[PDB]
Amino acid sequence: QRVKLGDIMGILNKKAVHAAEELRPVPGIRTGDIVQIRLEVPENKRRLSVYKGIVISRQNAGIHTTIRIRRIIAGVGVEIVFPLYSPNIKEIKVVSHRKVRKARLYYLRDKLPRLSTF
């Protein structure tokens, strides 16, 4: 039988994630994880950037599933979002995991610097 029209969103959403997973698997990430991301930069060719920090959110949106990474560089706080299933991301690690009690760590924007330094 064919595919019903009310389900095509899930199929395309499920199909792309399956292709990206076999091409590049990804572990299970939750709020509070401390990760280390390696992503290709088409501007240069030789090396790749290395961004790390604590996960302060995880928005589930299918193929465009995101994670926000807070980390303090050069004394100033910096929050960056990363789509998990992008082809630019070459490698992800999970260094450790902090104990938390919420889904989104927005309070750290007002807390001290040491809570986000790495």
Partner 1 sequence: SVDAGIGVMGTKLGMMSFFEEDGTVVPVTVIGFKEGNIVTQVKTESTDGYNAVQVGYERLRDRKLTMPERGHLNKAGVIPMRHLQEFRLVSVDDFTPSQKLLFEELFKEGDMVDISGTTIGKGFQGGIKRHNFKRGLMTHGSKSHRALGSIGAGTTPGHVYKGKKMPGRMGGTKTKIRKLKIMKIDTDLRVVMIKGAVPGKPGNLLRLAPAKIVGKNIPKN
Partner 2 sequence: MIQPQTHLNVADNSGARELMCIRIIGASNRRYARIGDVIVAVIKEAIPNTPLERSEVIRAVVVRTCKELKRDNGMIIRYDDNAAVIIDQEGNPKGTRIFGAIARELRQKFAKIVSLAPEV
Q: For binding to partner 1 (CB under 8 A), which residues are involved?
A: 2-3, 5-6, 8-9, 11-13, 16, 20, 40, 42, 62-64, 83, 85-88
Nearest of 46, 47, 68 to residue 57 by alpha carbon = 68
DSSP, collapsed to helix, strand or coil, labels residue 114 as: helix
Stretch that binds Mg ion, among 1-9, 28-36, 45-53, 59-67 (CB under 5 A): 59-67
Quick one: 52 or 58, whose CB is closer to RNA?
Answer: 58
**Spatial contact of 38 and 89, defined as CB atoms under 8 Å apart:** yes
Q: Is 50 in the site for partner 2 (CB under 8 A)?
A: no
The beta-carbon contacts of 47-50 under 8 Å, at least 24 apart in sequence, are 48/90
Binding residues vs partner 2 (CB under 8 A) = 41, 43, 49, 64, 66, 73-83, 86, 88, 109
